[PDB]
C-alpha cells in the first residue's frame, strides 16, 4: 500500500514495458518473493517467483508485444488496474488479446497479487 496513486501508474506502466521487451527476470523482480498470479482470472493461482518466472518465460520467450490501451486507474490503497493489448503469433497465426490486469502492491512497492481478466471473447485474429 506504500505506493502512492502516481507510483502505481508508473509501476504498472513499467510492467507493460517489461512484458513488451520480454525482460523476464526484470518482470519477476517486480513481484513480491511470494506473490500470486491468477491468469486468466478463474484459473488456479501461481505462487512464488520461481513459478511466476516459469509462467512468464513459457509465455514470452519466442514474438510477443504489448502496450497500454488506456491510462492506469489507481486507488489510494496501493491497488491498480490497467487496460492493454497483447499481440502474439499463434503457431503462425497472428493474434491479439485485450486484457485488464488488477494489481495490488505491497509496502515495498512490489506486486503482491495480479489478476488478469480475459477469455477467448477477447481474442482476435
Ligand X SMILES: C[C@]12CCc3c(ccc4cc(O)ccc34)[C@@H]1CCC2=O
Q: What is the phi-psi region of residue 22: left when phi exceeds 0, alpha when psi lies from -120 to 50, beta otherwise?
A: left
Q: Which is nearer to a copy of itself, 50 or 76 (CB)?
A: 76
Binding mask 63-102 for a copy of itself (x = CB under 8 A): ------xxx-xxxxx-xxxxx--------------xxx-x
For 58, residues 6+ apart whose C-beta sits below 8 A from its C-beta are: none
* The three grid cell numbers given for residue 94, joined into one nine-digit string: 497472428
Is the dihedral angle over the CA atoms 19, 21, 22, 23 positive or is it negative? negative
Q: Based on the residue annotation, tell me whether 56 is a catalytic residue of this protein.
A: no
- Matching residue, cell 495480479: 114
18 in contact with ligand X (CB under 6 A): no
- The active-site residue out of 23, 31, 34, 39 is 39
C-alpha span between 71 and 119 (Å, rounded): 22
Q: Is 101 annotated for ligand binding?
A: yes
64-93 binders of ligand X (CB under 6 A) = 64, 86, 88
Q: Considering the complex, what minimum distance in angstroms separates the CB of residue 33 from a copy of itself?
A: 25
Residue 39 contacts ligand X per CB under 6 A: yes
Give catalytic status of residue 15 as yes or no.
Answer: yes
Binding-site annotation: residue ranges for substrate: 101
Amino acid at each position: 500500500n506504500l505506493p502512492t496513486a502516481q507510483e502505481v501508474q508508473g509501476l504498472m506502466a513499467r510492467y507493460i514495458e517489461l512484458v513488451d521487451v520480454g525482460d523476464i527476470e526484470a518482470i519477476v523482480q517486480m513481484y513480491a518473493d511470494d506473490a500470486t498470479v491468477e491468469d486468466p482470472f478463474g484459473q488456479p493461482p501461481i505462487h512464488g517467483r520461481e513459478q511466476i518466472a516459469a509462467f512468464y518465460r513459457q509465455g514470452l520467450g519466442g514474438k510477443v508485444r504489448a502496450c497500454l490501451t488506456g491510462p492506469v486507474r489507481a486507488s489510494h490503497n496501493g491497488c491498480g488496474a490497467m487496460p492493454f493489448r497483447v499481440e502474439m503469433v499463434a503457431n503462425g497465426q497472428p493474434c491479439a488479446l485485450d486484457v485488464i490486469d488488477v494489481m495490488r502492491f505491497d509496502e515495498h512497492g512490489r506486486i503482491q497479487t495480479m489478476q488478469a481478466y480475459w477469455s477467448e471473447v477477447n481474442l482476435s485474429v
